[PDB]
Design a protein around this ligand. Structure first.
Ligand SMILES: CC(=O)O[C@H]1C(=O)[C@@]2(C)[C@H]([C@H](OC(=O)c3ccccc3)[C@]3(O)C[C@H](O)C(C)=C1C3(C)C)[C@]1(OC(C)=O)CO[C@@H]1C[C@@H]2O
Ligand SMILES: Nc1nc2c(ncn2[C@@H]2O[C@H](COP(=O)(O)OP(=O)(O)OP(=O)(O)O)[C@@H](O)[C@H]2O)c(=O)[nH]1
Ligand SMILES: Nc1nc2c(ncn2[C@@H]2O[C@H](COP(=O)(O)OP(=O)(O)O)[C@@H](O)[C@H]2O)c(=O)[nH]1
Ligand SMILES: [Ca+2]
Ligand SMILES: [Mg+2]
Ligand SMILES: [Mg+2]
Lengths: 424, 67, 440
C-alpha cells in the first residue's frame, strides 16, 4: 500500500482540510463514525492511501490537525465528521500567530512543531510504504503560512526521499482585509520553491471571481469559496484514490508535471461550473480561463505540462478525440520541446451530484501573473518598510525579506525564460 | 592443425570470459558511482535544511537580545 | 533439453505474459490448474512443449517463467486470477514501490534492492533445465521498471549466463496509451544499456497494434487487453517452432542465423496476418496467398515504418495451420513479381519459410476470429531505424532544455549517461544507413 499522510495547519488549512475529508469520505462510502456503507468495491480498493483501518472495520483519516489556537479545530471536532478524526492527531497551541509569518515560523510555531512531528512520525511508522505528504494551508495568515512551511522543512529532514505536496491558498484583497498578507505570502513562496515537490495554487482571487461572476453570488462566503476548493481537491486526488493507470501516485504525477524542480506550481481547474453536458463542452470548459482556480489566463503563457481527469460514464473515444482536438487547435500554447505533454485519465466514479466532471491540472508559465500580483503588493509595502516591526520584533532581518522577494522575482523570470524558449 | 584447433577454442573461451569480466566491472563501477551521486544529493539537501535550522537559532537568539 | 526461460518485467511485461501463457495453455491443452490430460508422461518428458513448461510429479505443467515488478498490484492479479494455480508463488516477485516511470529508479535506486532475489529465482528455474537454450525477456521501453530494471537484469544475466542467448519482446511507446512524458528518455537509456546484451529484439509499436485493432477488429478504443491478445498471437507464432515440432518446422534459431547479419543489427520487423473479426471471417476462408499478401502491407506491421524506403537483409515467413509448401511457393512467386522488395546487394534474396501444422487458437471472449491458417513475417529491413529516429527526435527536443533530467540526476545518474546513450543511438542509426549502401 502507498500511504499519504495529510496535514492541515491554521484556520484556512483546517477549514478546507475538513471539507476535503467530508467530500472524499462520501465518495469512498465512509460515514462520520468511520464505518463503510458504500456499494462499490472500487471505493475500497485504494482506501488505504488516505485511511488507516482499525479493528471493528473502522476507517480513520491519516490526517493531522495543527493550529496555534484551538478555535477552528474545536469547530472541526464539533462539525460533521468531527468524530472520524483520531483525537490524538489534534495538536494545538494557545497563543496564536496573529497573522504573523514570523510567529508561525520562528516563535510560537517552533515551540509546537516537535509535538506535531511526534504525530507525523507515529503515522508514518505505521505505513506499509509511505508515498509522502499533503499539506493544506493558506499563505496569507500566520499559522498556515509560517508554521506550515516550517513543518515542510522539518518533515523533509526526516523524509528527504518522500514527495511533499501542498494545497496553498493564495491571498487576495477581494477576500481578506489583512494588510500584511503580501509579506506572509512572499515569505511562504520563498519556502515552497525550495522544499515542496508540487504545489496546487488555490487563488482566493479566482475563487471569489468564480463565485461572483460565474455562480452569481453577490457576497461570497468562505463556505462558498471552500466548496470550489473541496470539489477541486477531490478532482486532483482522484487518480491517487481510485484504480488507474495515469498519475496514480504522487511521484509519477511529479515526474509527469515538473520538468524543472522550481517550476512546480500548478493551476487547477474544474468543470462544470454554473449557478444554482457533452464531452466537447466539458473539455472546452476545463481549458477556459473562467474555470481556473488560479487567477491567470493560460492564453497569456504556454503550457509545460497538463494533467486532465475525466470522471463519470462517458465514451473514451470521444474524450481522446476532444483532448487531441484541443491540443491541435491551440498548439501555440503548448511548448513544442516537450512532446506529448498532456496526459488524460478517466475514472468511472463521478463526484457527488454530477453525472460527469473534468478536472484540470496545468503547469503553465502564465502562473507568473499570480506571483507578479503578489510581488506587486509586496513591494508597495516593502519600499515604505510598512509593518516590518511585527517581523523584526520576532528576530528577523530586512535581508530575509529582500531574499524572499528576489527569489520570487527569480521564479517569475524563469517561467518567462521557458515561455520564450523555442525548439529550433 | 591440432594446435590451431586448440587455439580457436581457447580463444572462444578467452573472449567469453573477458566479456563477462568487462560487464561485471562496468556494472560495479556504475552502481558505485550511482550510489555516491545519490548520497551526495541527499547530503546536500539535508545540509541546506540544517543550515535553515541554524538560521532559525539566530532569529530566536536575535529576538532574545532585543528583549 | 532446449529449455527456454521467460522473464516478464513491469506492468507491460507481466500483462503480456498473462496473455501469452493463457494462449500457450490453450494451444497445448493445459488447464488452468496445470493439468494436461493428453500428456501421458507424468512428472517430466522431452516433448516439444517441455521447452516452455516443466512438469511436477502431480502432473502439473508449470511455465518456465518469472514475473517481476517493483510494485505488487499487477502481479497480485496473477496471484488471485484464473491461472493462479499455474505458477509456483516463488515465480511471482514483487516489491512495494515502483520506479515512478524513472529509468534511474528501475536500474538503480529501487531495482538494486530486488535484483539478487530475481536472479536467485531465475537460477532455480535454470537448475531444472537439462539444456537451457536462453531467455525471452518481455518489457516496455517507457516504464521505469520495464526500462531500468530490464537493463540491470540483462547486464546481470550476461555475467551469470555468459553468451547464453537473450531475446527481447519490447513494447515501443505510443502517445495513445503512454503514461509518462519521459518515455523517450527511458527508451533511449534502456536501448543503449541493453544493446550489447541482447541477441535479438522484437519491438512492438503500441501505436501499430492500436491501429490494427481499430482498423481490422473495429475496436473503437482498444484497451491493453485488446492489444495484448493480438501481441500474444505474434509472440506465439514466433515461439511456435520451439513448442511444437513437425516435418516442415524450422527452429527460431535458424531464422535467427539469417536475421542478424551484425551483432547490433538485431531488430527484426514482424508482420502478422490475418487479423480479422469473427463477423468478417465467417463468410470467407483466407487462403495462403491472401495472408501472405497481407504480410507486405505496411498496415499490418508491428512497428510503424516504411520498408519500401529501406532495403531488406532477410525475409522469413513463419506459417501455422493448414499450409503446404506448394501454396507458399505460388504465393511467394506472385509477390516477388508485384511488390517492392529490394535487398542489399550482399545478401541473397530468397525467402526462408517454416510451417507449423498445429492450427492457431484464440482465447474465449476475444476479438480475433479463429482461423485455419496464419503467418508471421520476420524481416530485417533498414527501415526499422525510422522507429529509432522518431524516439531520438523526442529525446533531443526535451534534452536540449534538460527537461525532467533532474529526476534522473536526483537518483544518482549523470548527464554523461544521457549523451552517451544518445550517441550510441546516433551510431546505431548510422549503422543502419551503412549496411544498406551498395558494395564497391
Ligand atoms: C444535483 C445537481 O445537479 O445539482 C448540482 C449543480 O447543479 C451544480 C450547479 C453545482 C452546485 O454548486 C454551486 O452552485 C456552488 C459551487 C461552489 C460554491 C458555491 C455554490 C451545487 O450547489 C453543489 C453540488 O456540488 C451539486 C453537484 C449541485 C448543487 C447542489 C446545486 C456546481 O458545483 C459543482 C461542485 O459541481 C456549481 O457549478 C457546478 C455545476 C453543477 O451542475
Ligand atoms: N501493449 C501493452 N503496453 C503496455 C501495457 N502496460 C503498459 N504498457 C505500456 O508500457 C509503458 C509504461 O510502462 P509500464 O510497463 O506500465 O511501467 P513499469 O514497467 O511497470 O514501470 P514503473 O511502473 O514506472 O515502475 C507505456 O508505454 C504503456 O503504454 C500492456 O499491458 N500492454
Ligand atoms: N478559501 C479559503 N480561504 C481562507 C479560509 N480561511 C481563511 N482563508 C484565507 O486565509 C488567509 C488568512 O490566513 P489564516 O488561515 O486565517 O491564518 P492562520 O490561521 O494563522 O494560518 C486570508 O487570506 C483568508 O482569505 C477558508 O476557509 N477558505
Ligand atoms: Ca510429460
Ligand atoms: Mg484568520
Ligand atoms: Mg509499474
Amino acid at each position: 500500500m502507498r500511504e499519504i499522510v495529510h496535514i492541515q495547519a491554521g484556520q484556512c488549512g483546517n477549514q478546507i482540510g475538513a471539507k476535503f475529508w467530508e467530500v472524499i469520505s462520501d465518495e469512498h462510502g465512509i460515514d462520520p463514525t468511520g464505518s463503510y456503507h458504500g456499494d462499490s468495491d472500487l471505493q475500497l480498493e485504494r482506501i488505504n492511501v488516505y485511511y488507516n483501518e482499525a479493528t471493528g472495520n473502522k476507517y480513520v483519516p491519516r490526517a493531522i490537525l495543527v493550529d496555534l489556537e484551538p478555535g477552528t479545530m474545536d469547530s472541526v471536532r464539533s462539525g460533521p465528521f468531527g468524530q472520524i478524526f483520531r483525537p490524538d492527531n489534534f495538536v494545538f497551541g494557545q497563543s496564536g500567530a496573529g497573522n504573523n509569518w514570523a510567529k508561525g515560523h520562528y516563535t510560537e510555531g517552533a515551540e509546537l512543531v516537535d509535538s506535531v512531528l511526534d504525530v507525523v512520525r507515529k503515522e508514518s511508522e505505521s505505513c506499509d510504504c509511505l508515498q509522502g505528504f499533503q499539506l493544506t494551508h493558506s499563505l496569507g495568515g500566520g499559522t498556515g503560512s509560517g508554521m506550515g512551511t516550517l513543518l515542510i522543512s522539518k518533515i523533509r529532514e526526516e523524509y528527504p526521499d518522500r514527495i511533499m505536496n501542498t494545497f496553498s491558498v493564495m491571498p487576495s484583497p477581494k477576500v481578506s482585509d489583512t494588510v500584511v498578507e503580501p509579506y506572509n505570502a512572499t515569505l511562504s513562496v520563498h519556502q515552497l520553491v525550495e522544499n515542496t515537490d508540487e504545489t496546487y495554487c488555490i487563488d482566493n482571487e479566482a475563487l471569489y471571481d468564480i463565485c461572483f461572476r460565474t455562480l452569481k453570488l453577490t457576497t461570497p462566503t468562505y463556505g462558498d469559496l471552500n466548496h470550489l476548493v473541496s470539489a477541486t481537491m477531490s478532482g486532483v486526488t482522484t487518480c491517487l484514490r481510485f484504480p488507474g493507470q495515469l498519475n496514480a501516485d504522487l511521484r509519477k504525477l511529479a515526474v509527469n508535471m515538473v520538468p524543472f524542480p522550481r517550476l512546480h506550481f500548478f493551476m487547477p481547474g474544474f468543470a462544470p461550473l454554473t449557478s444554482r453536458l457533452t464531452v466537447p463542452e466539458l473539455t472546452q470548459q476545463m481549458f477556459d480561463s473562467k474555470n481556473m482556480m488560479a487567477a491567470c489566463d493560460p492564453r497569456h503563457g504556454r503550457y509545460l505540462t497538463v494533467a486532465a481527469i475525466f470522471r463519470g460514464r462517458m465514451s473514451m473515444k470521444e474524450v481522446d478525440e476532444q483532448m487531441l482536438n484541443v491540443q491541435n487547435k491551440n498548439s501555440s500554447y503548448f511548448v513544442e520541446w516537450i512532446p506529448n505533454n498532456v496526459k488524460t485519465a478517466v475514472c468511472d466514479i463521478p463526484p457527488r451530484g454530477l453525472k460527469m466532471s473534468a478536472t484540470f491540472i496545468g503547469n503553465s508559465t502564465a502562473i507568473q501573473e499570480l506571483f507578479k500580483r503578489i510581488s506587486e503588493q509586496f513591494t508597495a509595502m516593502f519600499r515604505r518598510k510598512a509593518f516590518l516591526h511585527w517581523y523584526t520584533g520576532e528576530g528577523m532581518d530586512e535581508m530575509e525579506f529582500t531574499e524572499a522577494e528576489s527569489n520570487m522575482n527569480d521564479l517569475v523570470s524563469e517561467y518567462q525564460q521557458y515561455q520564450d524558449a523555442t525548439a529550433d | 592443425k591440432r594446435e590451431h584447433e586448440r587455439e580457436v577454442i581457447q580463444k572462444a573461451i578467452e573472449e567469453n570470459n573477458n566479456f563477462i569480466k568487462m560487464a561485471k566491472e562496468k556494472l560495479a563501477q556504475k552502481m558505485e558511482s550511482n550510489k555516491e551521486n545519490r548520497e551526495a544529493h541527499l547530503a546536500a539537501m539535508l545540509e541546506r535544511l540544517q543550515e535553515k535550522d541554524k538560521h532559525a537559532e539566530e532569529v530566536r537568539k536575535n529576538k532574545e537580545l532585543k528583549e | 533439453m532446449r529449455e527456454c526461460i521467460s522473464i516478464h518485467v513491469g506492468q507491460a511485461g507481466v500483462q503480456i505474459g498473462n496473455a501469452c501463457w493463457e494462449l500457450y495453455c490453450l494451444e497445448h491443452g493445459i488447464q488452468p490448474d496445470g493439468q494436461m490430460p493428453s500428456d501421458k508422461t507424468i512428472g517430466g518428458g522431452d516433448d516439444s512443449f517441455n521447452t516452455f513448461f516443466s512438469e511436477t510429479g502431480a502432473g502439473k505443467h508449470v511455465p518456465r517463467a518469472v514475473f517481476v515488478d517493483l510494485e505488487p498490484t499487477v502481479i497480485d492479479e496473477v496471484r488471485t486470477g484464473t491461472y493462479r494455480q499455474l505458477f509456483h508463488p516463488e515465480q511471482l516477485i514483487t516489491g512495494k514501490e515502483d520506479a515512478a516511470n524513472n529509468y534511474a529508479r528501475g536500474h538503480y535506486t529501487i531495482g538494486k534492492e530486488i535484483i539478487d532475489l530475481v536472479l536467485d529465482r531465475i537460477r532455480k528455474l535454470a537448475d531444472q533445465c537439462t539444456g537451457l537454450q536462453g531467455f525471452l525477456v518481455f518489457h516496455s521501453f517507457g516504464g521505469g521498471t520495464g526500462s531500468g530494471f530490464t537493463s540491470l537484469l540483462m547486464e546481470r544475466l550476461s555475467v551469470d549466463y555468459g553468451k547464453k542467448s537473450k531475446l527481447e519482446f519490447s513494447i515501443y511507446p505510443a502517445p495513445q496509451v503512454s503514461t509518462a512524458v519521459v518515455e523517450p528518455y527511458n527508451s533511449i537509456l534502456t536501448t543503449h544499456t541493453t544493446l550489447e546484451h541482447s541477441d535479438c529484439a522484437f519491438m512492438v509499436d503500441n501505436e501499430a497494434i492500436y491501429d490494427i485493432c481499430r482498423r481490422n477488429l473495429d475496436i473503437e478504443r482498444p484497451t491493453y487487453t485488446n492489444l495484448n491478445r493480438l501481441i500474444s498471437q505474434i509472440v506465439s507464432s514466433i515461439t511456435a517452432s520451439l513448442r511444437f515440432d513437425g516435418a516442415l518446422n524450422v527452429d527460431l534459431t535458424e531464422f535467427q542465423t539469417n536475421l542478424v547479419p551484425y551483432p547490433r543489427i538485431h531488430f527484426p520487423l514482424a508482420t502478422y496476418a490475418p487479423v480479422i473479426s469473427a463477423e468478417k471471417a465467417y463468410h470467407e476462408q483466407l487462403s495462403v496467398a491472401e495472408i501472405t499478401n497481407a504480410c507486405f502491407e505496411p498496415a499490418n506491421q508491428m512497428v510503424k515504418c516504411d520498408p519500401r524506403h529501406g532495403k531488406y537483409m532477410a525475409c522469413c515467413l513463419l506459417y501455422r495451420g493448414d499450409v503446404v509448401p506448394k501454396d507458399v511457393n505460388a504465393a511467394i512467386a506472385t509477390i516477388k513479381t508485384k511488390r517492392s522488395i529490394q535487398f542489399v546487394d550482399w545478401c541473397p534474396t530468397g525467402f526462408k519459410v517454416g510451417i507449423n501444422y498445429q492450427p492457431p487458437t484464440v482465447v474465449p471472449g476475444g476479438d480475433l476470429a479463429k482461423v485455419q491458417r496464419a503467418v508471421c513475417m520476420l524481416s530485417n529491413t533498414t527501415a526499422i531505424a525510422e522507429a529509432w529516429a522518431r524516439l531520438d527526435h523526442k529525446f533531443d527536443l526535451m534534452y536540449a532544455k534538460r527537461a525532467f533530467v533532474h529526476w534522473y540526476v536526483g537518483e544518482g545518474m549523470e548527464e554523461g549517461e544521457f549523451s552517451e546513450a544518445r550517441e550510441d543511438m546516433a551510431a546505431l542509426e548510422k549503422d543502419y544507413e551503412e549496411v544498406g549502401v551498395d558494395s564497391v
